[PDB]
Design a protein around this ligand. Sequence first.
Ligand SMILES: CCCCCCCCCCCC[N+](C)(C)[O-]
Ligand SMILES: CCCCCCCCCCCC[N+](C)(C)[O-]
Ligand SMILES: CCCCCCCCCCCC[N+](C)(C)[O-]
Length: 147
Amino acid sequence: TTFRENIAQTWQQPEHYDLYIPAITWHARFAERPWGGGFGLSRWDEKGNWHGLYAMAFKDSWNKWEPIAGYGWESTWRPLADENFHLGLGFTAGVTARDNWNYIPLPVLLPLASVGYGPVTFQMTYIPGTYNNGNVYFAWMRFQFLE
Ligand SMILES: CCCCCCCCCCCC[N+](C)(C)[O-]
Ligand SMILES: CCCCCCCCCCCC[N+](C)(C)[O-]
Ligand SMILES: CCCCCCCCCCCC[N+](C)(C)[O-]
């Protein structure tokens, strides 16, 4: 209900747009940047928490277009004298699709964490081993635009 309200508000009244550029991927516990990118809309809410709606493109194992689009949210902390430093933890609820399965929309739910300074943020997820080519951390820079 509040989740439905929140997504919409980002949809209807975004405050910024963002560019997402993949940065690094590594295997959880150690078991060129990754191809792709995305863009999105976002806002900081009155709790100072982050809401985003994004669309990204990657390349799958067959070198085929692999989209993901979704909503991201992070509970955000600004613990230092310079309020521009921000750390966050939340999740993303999204949809992806694969050439092998005729691009049928499939639900994805993943964790999110980030550390940034003002409009420049290192943000990441853990892709669980339940997914093909999973059990990896995947991180990107997010660049926030508009004042
Ligand atoms: C299902 C969620 C899809 C939401 C994706 C929204 C992305 C639109 C961002 C357009 C940004 C406009 N631009 C390029 C001038 O920044
Ligand atoms: C708020 C943005 C959330 C973006 C979540 C990205 C999840 C997909 C991770 C990329 C996977 C691409 N690849 C080729 C490694 O499978
Ligand atoms: C990207 C590196 C990992 C960052 C992990 C940061 C997690 C700190 C928790 C931030 C939220 C704090 N709190 C309780 C006010 O929400």
